[PDB]
Symmetry: D3
Subunit: 112 residues, 6 copies
């Protein structure tokens, strides 16, 4: 407080995509199940990190300066939820795309 | 299978702990109360965030343009309650949650 | 500051997930459903267990001699739903929780 | 695959922390000790509760009619230690857990 | 107030789940078993890491130069067990834990 | 797997130091207690992240190539434990110093 960094969300969302990518490589049901367990945990951790930035780091001036930020954060969380439900790495990548947009705004607010 | 009652019950616990902190200034008790209040407020925030991210959909945010900011204020109110002993901060959090609850059940109709 | 509604809500998710499992045989969906069910049943169990350990007091147990066994039955009902895809097991857990809910509010009056 | 030793170990930490609290009045140390105690007692309670819900079965409860109340007493003993700095409260919890340990291993023979 | 028994009991749960996975290939059961095995192995690893970081001291690492690598191998064995259904991987983890336990109790003398 | 980054440990250890620094600014017992609660959680999260890198990311060749790494990781965890017990920001900073040493080795292993 107020030491926050979207790197946490990003790293956990990379785990999600990485796991998705491995699920194409190994049809072993045990492996598929473990991958699914891990992916569920990591996506939910990524969502917590995104949510925390939104509620705890970003403040009223940030939301006036970036009117799009509320919806962007909601979209990010929903993208992470869709990645959670999926084996398709494109869904993981979409969540990473959104997180990158949060990250860009974040580092701007550190400047002014 | 979402119900704002989960956020409510947790925020009610926050407020009840604040009230109890006013009636006993034993430092051990004060510390225990602070510990319990910190966890309850974070659980409440989790539950609120989950409604916002997982239950509410773009049609709802269209119909209720103030919803995004309401949820953010609610989470910020819960953080303020977390950092305070004043039961009125717990009550403000509950007030915000009641407004979410109103909208939530309106979308269930 | 307790409410068996917390247990109920979680047990309701258990049943809901069981129902979803009948309509979609995709292995990944079945796996995720199973993962989610496991967590939700254990959360419901935690809520039930806490009521029993922290809310209910000696006077309640003397007034309700069946309550120890009711709560244990509830927990085993939830474990049974955890290990099953049959929504009837989810409903049975809900039925037991409902019996705890009634007793709870009688003690609050 | 259960063992009341898990509950014991956690309850032992509770008592140990209570003892440390007598020899060091630094507020920060007292606060940390209180934080740690709270967690450890709740872990011990979780372990005790799981035994009761998941390990003990109807035959055990008929064979040991006092077991429901023994376990509930144990949990309240742990809650009492959680809310106290007196090592005697920690020891009382350990004593109850020891009674559960004996019953447990009788059921395993 | 450390005891390698916590790591052991958790790794014993890993092995018992692996054995049980060999006796029933129902996919729902297999998934549940995988979920439970994943949590147990991580708890075991947590407990092992805690002994290494919080209990063992520089004099111990001097007296037992192989201890650092033993602990790392133990954690790696537990990860291997986590990723496998072979009960022999669970047993290798327990074997490593038994070597830590031997050293641990030697340092208590 | 194998997507790991010592940034996670570092960010949580920065939280620890930041909290330590705030405890000098406000003598309110409630505030001191909250600071203590948060500091305990964040330090233990930092320790998990350090431990995970050591057990899950680093492999036998890394430990032969860096014979000091086992002890360095143990020192890092103990430093985080000492920071956990303390209000002195210097203890937080020491844990960050150690984490930086892990981070340097880490990014070398990503190159070869």
């Amino acid at each position: 407080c107020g030491v926050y960094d979207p790197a946490q969300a990003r790293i956990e969302a990379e785990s999600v995509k990485a796991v998705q990518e491995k699920m194409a490589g190994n049809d072993d049901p045990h492996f598929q199940t473990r991958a699914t367990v891990i992916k569920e945990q990591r996506a939910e951790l990524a969502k917590h990190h995104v949510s925390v930035l939104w509620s705890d780091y970003f403040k009223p001036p940030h939301f006036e300066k970036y009117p799009e930020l509320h919806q962007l954060v909601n979209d990010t969380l929903k993208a992470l939820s869709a990645a959670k439900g999926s084996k398709d790495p494109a869904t993981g990548q979409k969540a990473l795309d959104y997180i990158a947009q949060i990250d860009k705004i974040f580092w701007e607010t550190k400047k002014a």
